[PDB]
């Protein structure tokens, strides 16, 4: 019966909590003791990309750590050369309401999507000298909030219709659709080996999915408000999440439970974007108070701040070789910190 | 110069891109962006039918002025996540059907939406053009039945003028802060012609206020 089903679900949740807290021998902070801290490391801005004329909502690095793609509300997708601040490409968009941009690991394509409920794939390297649309991936019933490239043919797109999906670009159809996520899912982060991907939604629940199977492997809770940022640890066995609670939480796939929470009393603003430094020692988080805080991953302290932005820091990213970190903002400025 | 020939050509192409970006931004800055809002089947079609899937954007011109009006009603998702994207619009065209006071009640839902949106932290200083359409249907309904058909809080006359004024007062009293934004109200029906002018006066007033805030008098 329905009461029987609800009781079974509650008993299953209690059993899962008991199993989760049984394996919780110790927390990361207790283990990480008698060890030299990272130190009060501070970085200086090296470049300043000054092309956009509206709020910047997303940025993505290339695999070569040189090219950079940024999206903004003036209907412009600009490709940057971070070394020389040269503008390689400036791609007009049919819809200026975009919230995410993606850069293919092969570098031949970019992907952007937003309130028009479509993910657009743009061909960077054409016989003609321009950037052209390849396919438009319609099929979501909400705004697209994140999208990442598996390869030149597979792209996984989050949405505001509470679902994630995996697309076949050549056919323009969803090979598998990821459902079972109450509330709009706001972010996603592919695994380093591109066989799993996590996604955080407005229900403060982060789910881990199997790309081929299509089923949610694990579900993580602990956030008090909705989830805006998510990113895999370099090791592939952990991932961090940023929420409106002014808290960053480190989870663990192989423990199915939260490791530690990064927070400070002086911080009450939401968290917009999160990313990990190479070797996973530093956690880089973008906030609503116009500032980005360098969180030491092992401990729960701030390694340093960078500030340098006059409006909300909406996005950030770290290069594949860890040379620099680029932060976007609502003041239409990108800064390549090093 | 410590630059190769192709580096110089790259900087030249980047400067051409910069010129085009400046031109595009200067062209966009001469456009008025309006956020259409309101429940479905609440006269939104009538007010969008005067001139010229997710957002359904419409573009219309009047007296050498260009309007970029956006309809986001079909989002059907958590507004708080994407509502800041429209922060900075010229004005909000909020459409409410008068006749939907008995058809679980549509007027209560519209009032809740108006209270949520008009008091949003993003929109604390944007004017609201409250369009009150379907007044002939309100005429017929009031002739058939007074507003007290479902609302016992009313105590006035069962006439169209007084009831419409009472509804307008109740809507305009929803906002906590009257000292920071101006709520414009209009009465329209299926066949009007001067509806396009009311938004023109509203946008002219907010343009003047923006100029005053720019120079710093305001």
């Amino acid at each position: 019966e329905l009461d029987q089903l609800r009781q079974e679900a509650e008993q299953l949740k209690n059993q899962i909590r008991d199993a989760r807290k049984a394996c919780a021998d110790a927390t990361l902070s207790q283990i990480t003791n008698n060890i030299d801290p990272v130190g009060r490391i501070q970085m200086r801005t090296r470049r300043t990309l000054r092309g956009h004329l509206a709020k910047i909502y997303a940025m993505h690095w290339g695999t070569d750590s040189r090219l950079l793609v940024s999206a903004s509300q003036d209907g412009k997708l600009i490709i940057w050369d971070s070394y020389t601040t040269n503008k390689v490409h400036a791609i007009p968009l049919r819809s200026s309401w975009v919230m995410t941009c993606a850069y293919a690991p092969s570098g031949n394509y970019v992907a952007c999507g937003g309130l028009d409920n479509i993910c657009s794939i743009y061909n960077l390297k054409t016989r003609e000298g321009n950037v052209r649309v390849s396919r438009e991936l319609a099929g979501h019933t909400g705004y697209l909030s994140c999208c990442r490239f598996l390869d030149d043919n597979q792209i996984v797109t989050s949405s505001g219709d509470t679902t994630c999906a995996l697309w076949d670009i050549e056919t323009g159809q969803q090979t598998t659709t990821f459902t079972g996520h109450t509330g709009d899912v706001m972010s996603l982060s592919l695994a380093p080996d591109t066989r799993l991907f996590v996604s955080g939604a407005c229900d403060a629940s982060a789910k881990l999915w199997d790309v081929r199977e299509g089923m949610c492997r694990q579900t993580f809770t602990g956030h008090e408000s909705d989830i805006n940022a998510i990113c895999f640890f370099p090791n592939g066995n952990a991932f961090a999440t940023g929420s409106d609670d002014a808290t960053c939480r480190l989870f663990d796939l192989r423990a199915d439970q939260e490791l530690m929470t990064y927070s400070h009393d002086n911080i009450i603003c939401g968290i917009t974007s999160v990313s990990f430094s190479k070797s996973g020692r530093l956690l880089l988080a973008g906030y609503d108070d116009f500032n980005c805080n360098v969180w030491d991953a092992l401990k729960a302290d701030r390694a340093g701040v960078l500030a340098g932005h006059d409006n909300r820091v909406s996005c950030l990213g770290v290069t594949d070789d860890g040379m620099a970190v680029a932060t976007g903002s609502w003041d239409s400025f990108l800064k390549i910190w090093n | 110069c410590t630059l190769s020939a192709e580096d110089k050509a790259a900087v030249e192409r980047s400067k051409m891109i910069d010129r085009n970006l400046r031109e595009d931004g200067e062209k966009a800055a001469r456009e008025v962006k309006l956020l259409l809002l309101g429940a479905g089947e609440s006269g939104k079609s009538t007010i969008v039918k005067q001139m010229k899937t997710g957002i359904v954007e419409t573009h219309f011109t009047f007296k050498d002025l260009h309007f970029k009006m956006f309809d986001v009603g079909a989002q059907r998702s958590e507004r708080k996540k994407w509502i800041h994207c429209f922060e900075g619009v010229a004005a909000i065209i909020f459409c409410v059907a008068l006749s939907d006071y008995d058809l679980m009640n549509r007027m209560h839902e519209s009032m809740k939406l108006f209270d949520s949106i008009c008091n949003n932290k993003w929109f604390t200083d944007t004017s609201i053009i409250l369009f009150l359409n379907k007044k002939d249907l309100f005429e017929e309904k009031i002739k058939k039945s007074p507003l007290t058909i479902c609302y016992q809080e009313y105590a006035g006359s069962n006439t169209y003028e007084e009831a419409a004024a009472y509804i307008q007062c109740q809507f305009e009293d929803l906002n906590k802060r009257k000292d920071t934004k101006e709520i414009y109200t209009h009465f329209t029906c299926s066949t009007d012609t001067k509806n396009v002018q009311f938004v023109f006066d509203a946008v002219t007033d907010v343009i003047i206020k923006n100029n005053l805030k720019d120079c710093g008098l305001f």
Partner: single-chain antibody
Amino acid sequence: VQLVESGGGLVQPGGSRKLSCSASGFAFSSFGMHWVRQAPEKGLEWVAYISSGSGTIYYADTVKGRFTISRDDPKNTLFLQMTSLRSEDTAMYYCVRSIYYYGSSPFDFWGQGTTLTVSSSDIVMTQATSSVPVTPGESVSISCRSSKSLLHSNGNTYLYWFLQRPGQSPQLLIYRMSNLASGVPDRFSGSGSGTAFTLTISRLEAEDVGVYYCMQHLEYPLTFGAGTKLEL
């Protein structure tokens, strides 16, 4: 993507003419066009360069004054007005498209060419091989010499390789030292370091035989080299 060039013919010395080339099938207005000359028996010689948006314009020292380069972006046409033609100006002229940004491939396409007959510092880039005979299925390694280092301070070596099969316009093979172009087989591989460079073909076919040219883009003017002909 085609570049059909027109004009040309028999012109008496000291006369004037207007070379034209119509671009189609690609974004003409975003490409920096070149003009490259080839005498009936000699190699390739660079003539003029115009940038995107008609910005920087370059001429070689031997063509300045009497040669002018212009483009019509809405008309999709590139012009080359020539006056006071000398006896050394008889050659075939190729319209070459080029685009310059990070990771791009300049000189990626060449026009069909037009003929012109008239009655009658720089970087030295020469290669010391010519008319090398070789059989299909073998491996070749031709080399090019530069007067000075072609390695720029940013880490890029500006050396290009071109194959001119007989009866048709040259095509780009290597668009920078160790950078293979699009549509050319993986058997080709440019290499080199410092001042000396070379091009190796692993298993040549029977159709990739012709004149091989090494060109520099380090400084203007762009200096080609004498060819290295390959035959059966």
